[PDB]
Amino acid sequence: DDLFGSASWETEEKMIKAKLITPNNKKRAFDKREVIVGRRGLGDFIAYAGQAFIGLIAPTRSGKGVGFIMPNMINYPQNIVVFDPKADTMETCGKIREKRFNQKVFIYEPFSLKTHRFNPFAYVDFGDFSTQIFGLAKLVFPERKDPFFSNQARNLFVINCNIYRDLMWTKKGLEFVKRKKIIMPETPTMFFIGSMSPATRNMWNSFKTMGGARETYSSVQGVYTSAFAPYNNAMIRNFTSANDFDFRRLRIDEVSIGVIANPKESTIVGPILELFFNVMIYSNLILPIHDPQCKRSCLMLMDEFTLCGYLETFVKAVGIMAEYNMRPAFVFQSKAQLENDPPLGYGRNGAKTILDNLSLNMYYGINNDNYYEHFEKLSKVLGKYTRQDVSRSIDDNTGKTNTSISNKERFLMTPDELMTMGDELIILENTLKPIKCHKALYYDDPFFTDELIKVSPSLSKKYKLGKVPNQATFYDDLQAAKTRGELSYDKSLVPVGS
Amino acid sequence: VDDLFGSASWETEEKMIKAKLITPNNKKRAFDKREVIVGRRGLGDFIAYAGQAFIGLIAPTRSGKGVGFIMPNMINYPQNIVVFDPKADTMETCGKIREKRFNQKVFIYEPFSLKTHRFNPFAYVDFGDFSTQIFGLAKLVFPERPNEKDPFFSNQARNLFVINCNIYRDLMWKGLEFVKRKKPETPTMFFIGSMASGINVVSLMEFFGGGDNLRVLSPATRNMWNSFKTMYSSVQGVYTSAFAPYNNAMIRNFTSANDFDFRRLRIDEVSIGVIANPKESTIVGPILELFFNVMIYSNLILPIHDPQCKRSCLMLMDEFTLCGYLETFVKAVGIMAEYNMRPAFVFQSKAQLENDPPLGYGRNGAKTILDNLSLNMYYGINNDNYYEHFEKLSKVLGKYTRQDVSRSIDDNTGKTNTSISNKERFLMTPDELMTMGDELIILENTLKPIKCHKALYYDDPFFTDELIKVSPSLSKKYKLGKVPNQATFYDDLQAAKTRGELSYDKSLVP
Amino acid sequence: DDLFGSASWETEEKMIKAKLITPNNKKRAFDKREVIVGRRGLGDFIAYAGQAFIGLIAPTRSGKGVGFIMPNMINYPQNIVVFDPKADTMETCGKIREKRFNQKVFIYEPFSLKTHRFNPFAYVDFGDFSTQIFGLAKLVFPERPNEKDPFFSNQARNLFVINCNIYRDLMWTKKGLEFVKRKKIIMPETPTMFFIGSMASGINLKVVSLMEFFGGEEDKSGDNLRVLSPATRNMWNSFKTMGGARYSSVQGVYTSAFAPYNNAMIRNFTSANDFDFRRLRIDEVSIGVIANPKESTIVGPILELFFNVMIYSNLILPIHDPQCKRSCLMLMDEFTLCGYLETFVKAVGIMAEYNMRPAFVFQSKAQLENDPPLGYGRNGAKTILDNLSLNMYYGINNDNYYEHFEKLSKVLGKYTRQDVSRSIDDNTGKTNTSISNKERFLMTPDELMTMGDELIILENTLKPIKCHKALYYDDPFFTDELIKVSPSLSKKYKLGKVPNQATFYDDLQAAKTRGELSYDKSLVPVGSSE
Structure with a gap:
């Protein structure tokens, strides 16, 4: 009966047809570039194939790293670009990325001398020319009681890059600079642009265009400098000092890219990460x-x-990134933080645009009164099924009993039940009924601890391959081995600046 | 028939027949009312919107908007089509169908390719209507600025475009006297982008004009410049920034001439495909704005x-x-219906439509567009972010009366009791809408809700018959009239697209 | 029983007592200026008498024209001022208004030269004056809730009034005419808004500034200041102490307040005043306004004047x-x-006893509640809605309107119904029947959304009414008047009979394109820019 609802968990057959699992799931080949999202047991994983995007709604300290980040870092066989703010994911899986999958590891740490460098001017064709320049200017000065001037500073950057262009990729400009009057580089950086032929005739007309420098140079230059100020920092100047990896080969070479950044601790790195991800995504259409x-x-x-x-690059790109095999899995604390206003969010409709492009959503549960509403909604989303309710009556004199059966509605999962799943989670795929499964714990499964023990001598002496490691000491020995760099990527190839 | 808990019900066959969505013999329907397929009740039994009203399809990702709505109408629609094909699959799959089935000329506008087509907005002027055309393109190129560094510049640049167009009509018409002064006549965008430097760079207040050319150029042709000399460098900068996308060889080739007369969009049997990805190349925004402006307003x-x-x-x-x-569609959907310009809008969610005007249409613009959709299709997906959307939909379907049975047993003996009662039930719960799968819900403004199956094209021989009889690579493997094998039809269709044998006439496009 | 509700539809009694229907309703005389709002059958209408105001909450494409506007356009025996942004209502009922009611038809199309003209300065007695001039100034220069810098708008309004006093003391005085003739001052007779705005640059001779012509370097002898009145001179001194020191920002906002009048169409529409709005309740006239402020914001303020002067000229x-x-x-x-x-917000509560009877047609209550830019604000929308006593609600099956109908469902209330349950001994076959009471919505939300061509009428002093739309195209009560007017409709369709529903609307559009159902356009003045 379905009078009080028809909610139900998805069947094994439909999950097989959706390629989430295989008939012999424990012996599955993992040959469809699948992302592990859950487990039915040790080595019995649920994995997402295709090109659809994954969303992970994981509260703080709910186990997103040990149940999603680390397992796919250890298992996923294609290229990976991971956001690593705590500098622990790469420190734990880089040796696996380099030894198991034979992938070069690139670490982008803007706030440290030891980092790989990214320069956006390495992605322009100095010799659709000015399109890249205008997009870069839009990134440098974001579009927003004080209009204009910022647009004049964007034009200043426009003919700034145009001036450097004319200064090198011209045959006479080479001699003009060979007069030893300036010290321009061979390839430009953002700091250099900030410190600074009929198209050049129009550029001179722009040098006398709106008169942005006539009695108004001070404010335009002030806004320009407030925008280019991140590059007065030595760490940021070193981050933009060169370009070590070409993002146009992100789908060609076998690479793993870690990004060690934190814009909440320092609002300065925001635009650099923006440029970084914009060029990375827009180098692979x-x-x-x-x-x-x-x-x-x-x-x-x-x-x-x-x-x-x-x-905003993500807001504009999510709807077209899928077919180019740029497959993101977004992990956010809660949806409420996503929809927030531009400064620390994406707006309501921008966050909705991002979330609409997620076809698999994992929901972890924690018992926190701050997440009630969310989980309540989740309860309502799972729907209700029909259940039998039994009542009994007894004649207090004779003692005979009567049993009555009626139908009632029951939530597939109540809010508090969702909040107290512990290591269980809900999976919602767009084309499937709700699924309940276990977190793909990496430290619990030999499927991943074998790969962790293989590349480390210490764990190889302590624990045997194939056996579940002694849970009372495995994590601590993993940390002790991480202190000596056994699990970390080879840091000798990470360049160091002055 | 009890309505004690509401009277929610699917639309009856009789009212659907009256609404021309189906016929008394729907399997043998002739499709003689220019109907758009919006779903099926079975193999070849389609629901089809007649009339002039507009369709809206809220289809999320991984939902089958193309295979369930775009591809079937592409195979079936007998009149002219203008499709937005950003992924280059729809046209590369149905072009030979539009060519061989309905004898229609296929015209593909792919600005970022050599094999493209040409659109010149200048071929739409009365070479009393030339001044009207000048004002029209001046309004279409200079929009209203609610908050600018100054609205005076906006109005003055509109007036400068108007006056330059008047002077250009003056010089290009005794137009041959000045031709013999120096060493094309059909204007293009970046040659009009040079219409601010000079004849080739003469001064913007001298040359051979105003001197004393108030009478040399017919009254107003050189008179407005005498009055608009107050109420050049920044003006040239703004004009060059506006015309700069034409400097790219792709757009340059796009606006180099015109191979189609959009005033004949409802005359000749044609099919217009448009290949563009503004999310990738953000420069085609204004360009497509003028494109659709001239495509719609030249058909009003x-x-x-x-x-x-x-x-x-x-x-x-x-x-x-x-x-x-x-903004063309925002300003046009309210009057287009009576002109047989029938759009069907396909989008992922209401929120994506309500996005800010730069990347969306704005809340008010989205409402203005949605208010002109009389038939709304709803595909279902099990995504928490859509709950509020489907819950409301559930509430819109209503409640009906169902029977509830309760049994009671006398444990001492075993005799039983059955008792029935009436209870309310949503016609469809939110989670039931979310898990429809291949089903969908149609809401027509003047009808009761309709539930049906997606009109899939690879499923039905109603469409595979055409796709097979058209390409030679598919005619050998599969036969007509029979539903082909589901395990190998899609891959054979992919392979037929690889060879282009199921595409169209590529040789024609310039 | 009323334990679970007492909601019910109004009886024929109370409707008769409310004068909404009569005993011989089919043969009703229509002698109490009634507005048709519904029908219980062909030629059996529900019609609102009295002076109360009507609202029609009709979603888009829900039949407001064919069910409300066109019926009363055909039937209403008194004067009609219609809003016709699509120019279709007039095109369909003009010759009915003219031939059946002997009413002169005026057309106000501020974007077609074939238009009647309107000039607010024609409603001012120059040679009482201060009150009307200040009202017109507040109309052209309205208050702003921004409040970050209202002094400039205040001084711009002061400049407007001052310019008006200067014009009055020059063209409606005795020595001012001699002064204008001696110094060759270009100044027309009856003033227009365009000229009052152009007076910001100065007095036309070329043109010199006001600060120069009066008390400046151009007025060396000081004679040009003496020609003005002492009150105007004191106001000019006050303004020179206000804006004239440290004016540059006042002239800009002043000239911007008259920017719509740099347009040629608005110039022609303003140049004269064809119909006297003080005669709106004496002569038998029918006025059609063909404009669209969403297609062009320029006509926004113009309409604001046009309607305002229309209301206050009939109090x-x-x-x-x-x-x-x-x-x-x-x-x-x-x-x-x-x-x-703003005139409607301020005047809905006072224009009822003046027989200015508006019927507002909007798509939703939420769109009316829109902020001042595209709506009236929550408070203003409530103010307007509080003065509507008969509200018609059309239904469409569209989720964008669900929240509107749920509420309406709740507004209709619940009533008490009987519910039967059945039991049965599965061995002996004996059964049991039980009856209880339950609640039932008079109309569920989905029932309202699927109402089709039925509508709900809520009158302030009655119970809910459910009736059929007063469709004109299927009722001989209206098609008789529409066929009596067109010769070919008379050649095809017979009077007193329901016209062929498959072909009547199309043949009607055909006869309309030939202008047979339209007003006589020969009497509409035509202008030209030169």
């Missing part, structure tokens, strides 16, 4: 049919996504 | 005023939110 | 003047399209 070399997939483990702030 | 004449414009044209606005800010 | 009791016995039904069709018109 080439279909594998048009470029047969771009065959690999790039899983983007956007851990601590809401900590990144407003990245 | 009633068929009673010109019966030669007899054909209808369905605008399959697939990925409508992708187009960006197309 | 006279019939005991003051016995010529004002004619009522004026104001078919405010597509009301929110007119944007924010």
Whole structure:
């Protein structure tokens, strides 16, 4: 009966048809670039294939790292770009990325000398020219009681880059600079642009265009400098000092990219991460049919996504990124933090645009009164099924009994039941009925601890491969081995600046 | 038939027949009312919207908007179509169908490719209507500024465009006397982008004009410049920034000439595909704005005023939110219906439509567009972010009366008792709508809710028959009239698209 | 029993007592200026008498024209002021208004040269004056809730009034005419808004500034200041102490307040005043306003004046003047399209006893509650809605309107129904029947959304009414008047019979394109810019 609802968990057959599991799931090949989202037991995983996007609504300290980030870091066989704010994911899985999958590891730490460098001017064709320049200016000066001037500063950056362009990629400009009057580089950086032929005739007309420098140079220059100020920092200047990896090969070479950043601790790094992700996403709108070399997939483990702030590039790109095998999995504390106003959010409709492009959503549960509303909604989303309710009557004189059966409604999962799942989680796929499963714990499964023990001598002496490690001492020995860099990526290839 | 708990019910067959969505013999329906397929009740048993009202399809991702709505009407619609094809699959799959089935000329506008087509907004002027055209394009190129650094510049740049167009009509018409002064006549965008430096760079207040050319150029042709000399560098900068996208060879080739007369969009049997991804290339925004402006406004004449414009044209606005800010549709959907310009908008959610005007249409613009959709299709997906959307939909379907049975046993003996009662039940609960799968809900403004199946094209031989009889690679493997094998039809169709044998006439496009 | 509710539909009794219907309703005389709002059958109408105001909450494409506007356009025997943004209502009922009611038809299309003109300065007695001038100034220069810098708008309004006093003391004085003739001052007779705005640059001779012509370097002898009145001179001194020191920002906002009048169409529409709005309740006239403020914000303020002067020119009791016995039904069709018109918010509560009877037609209560830019604000929307005593509600099956109908469902209330349950011994076959009482919505939300061509009428002093739309195209009560007017409709369709429903609307559009159902356009003045 369905009078009081028809809610139900998804069947094993439909999950097989959706390719989430296989008939012999414990012996599955993992040959469809699948992302592990849950487990039915040790080595019996639920994994998402295809190109659809994953959302993980994980409260603070709910186990997103040990149940999603670390398992896929250890298992996923294609390219990975992971957000690593605590500098622990890469420190734990880099040796696996390099030894098991044979992938070069690039670490982008803008607030440290030891980092790989990214320069956006390495992605322009100095010699659709000015399109990249205008997009870069839009990134440098964001669109927003004080209009104009900022647009004049964007024009200042426009003909700034145009001036440096004319200064090098011209045959006479080479001699003009060979007069030894300026010290411009061979390839420009953002700091250098900030410190600074009929198209150049129009550029001179722009040098006398709206008169932005006539009795109004002070304010325009002040806004320009307030925008270019992040590059007065030595760490940021070193981060933009060069470009070590070409993002146009993110789907060609076998690479793993970690980003160690924190814009909440310092609002300065915001625009640099914005530029970084914009160039990374916009360097791969080439279909594998048009470029047969771009065959690999790039899983983007956007851990601590809401900590990144407003990245409008994602809002504009999520709806078209899927077919290019740029597959992000967003992990945010809660939806409420996502919809917030631009400064620390994406707006209501922008967050809705991002969330509409997620086809698999994992829901962890914690018993916190601050997450009630959310979980309540989740309860209502799972719907109700029909249940039998038994009542009894007894004649107090004779003692005979009467049993009555009626139908009632029951939530598939009540709010407090959702809040007290512990290590269980709910999976909602767009085309499937709700699923309940266990977190793919990495430290509990030999499926991942074997890979962790393989590449480390200490764990190899302590624990045997294939056996579940002694839970009372495994994590501590893993930490002790991480202190000596046994699990970390080889840090000798990470460049160091002055 | 009890309405004690509401009277919610699906629309009856009789009322659907009266609404021309189906016929008394729907399997043998002739499709003679220019109907748009919006779902099926079975193999070849389709529900089809007649009339002139507009369709809206709220189809999320991984929902089958193309395979359930775009592809079937592409195979089936007998009149003219204008499809938005950003992924290059719809046209590359149905072009040979539009060509061979309905004898229609396929015209593909892919600005970012050599094999493209050409659109010149200048071929739409009365070479009393030339001044009207000048004012029209001046309004279409200079929009109203609610908050600018100054509205005076906006109005003055509109007036500068108008006066420059008047002077250009003056010089290009005794137009041959000045031709013999120096060493094309059909204007293009970035050659009009040079219409601010000079004849080639003469001064913007001298040259051979105003001197004393108030009478050399017919009254107002050189008179407005005498009055607008107060009420050049920044003006040239703004004009060059406006015309700069034309400097790209792609857009340059797009606006180099014109191979189609949009005033004949309802005359000749044609099919217009548009390949564009403004989310990737953000520069095509204003360009597509002018494109659709001239495509729609050049068709705003009633068929009673010109019966030669007899054909209808369905605008399959697939990925409508992708187009960006197309204020044409915001200002036009309220009057287009009576002109046989019939759009069907396809979008992922209401929120994506309500996005801010730069990347969406705004709340008020989204409401203005949604208010002109009389038939609304609802595909279901099990996504928490859509709960509020489907719950309301559930509430819109209503409640009906159902029977509730309670049994009671006398344990000492075993004799039983059955008791029935009436209870309320939502016609469809929110979580039931969320898990419809291949089903969908149609809401027509003047009808009761309709539930049906998605009109899939690979499922039904109603469409695979055409796709097979058209391409030679599929005719050998599969036969007509029979539903082909589901395990190998899609891959064979992919492979047929690889060879282009199921595409269209690529040789024609410039 | 009323334990679970007592909601019910109004009986034929109370409707008769409310004068909404009569005993011989089919043969009703229509002698109490009634507005048709519904029907219980072909030619069996529900019609509102009295002076109360009507509201029609009709979603888009829900039949407000065919069910309300066009029926009363055909039937209403008194004066009609209709809003016709699509120019279709007039095009369909003009010759009915003219031939059946002998009413002169005026057309106000501020974007077609074929239009009648309106000039607010024609409603001012120059040679009382201060009150009307200040009212017109507050109309052109309205208050702002921003309050961050209202002094500039105040001084711009002071400049407007001052310019008006200067014009009055120059063109309606005795020595001012001699002064203008001696110094060759370009100044027209009856003033227009365009000229009052152009006076910001200065007095036309070229043109020199006001600060120069009066008390400046151009007025060396000081004679040009003496020609003005002492009150105007004191106001000019006060303004020179106000804006004239440290004016540059006042002239900008002043010239911006007259920017719509740099347009040629608005210039022609303002140049004259064809119809006297003080005659709206004496002569038999029918006025059609063809504008669209959403298509162009320029006509926004113009309409604001146009309607305002129309209302306040008709605030006279019939005991003051016995010529004002004619009522004026104001078919405010597509009301929110007119944007924010303060005159309606301020005047809905006072224009009822003047026989200015508006019927507001809007798509939803939420769109009317929109903020001043595109609506009236919550408080203003409530103010307008509080003065509507008969509200018609159309239904459509559209989720965007669900919250509107749920509430309406709740407004209709619940009633008590009987519910039967059955039991049965599964062995002996003996059964049991039980009856209880339950509650039932008079109309569930989905029932209202699927009402089709039925509607709900809520009158302030009655119980809910459910009736059928007063469709004109299927009722000989209206098609008789529409076929009596067109020769070919008379050649095809017979009077007193329901026309062929498959072809009547199409043949009607055909006859309309030939202008047979339209007003005589020969009497509409035509201008030209030169």
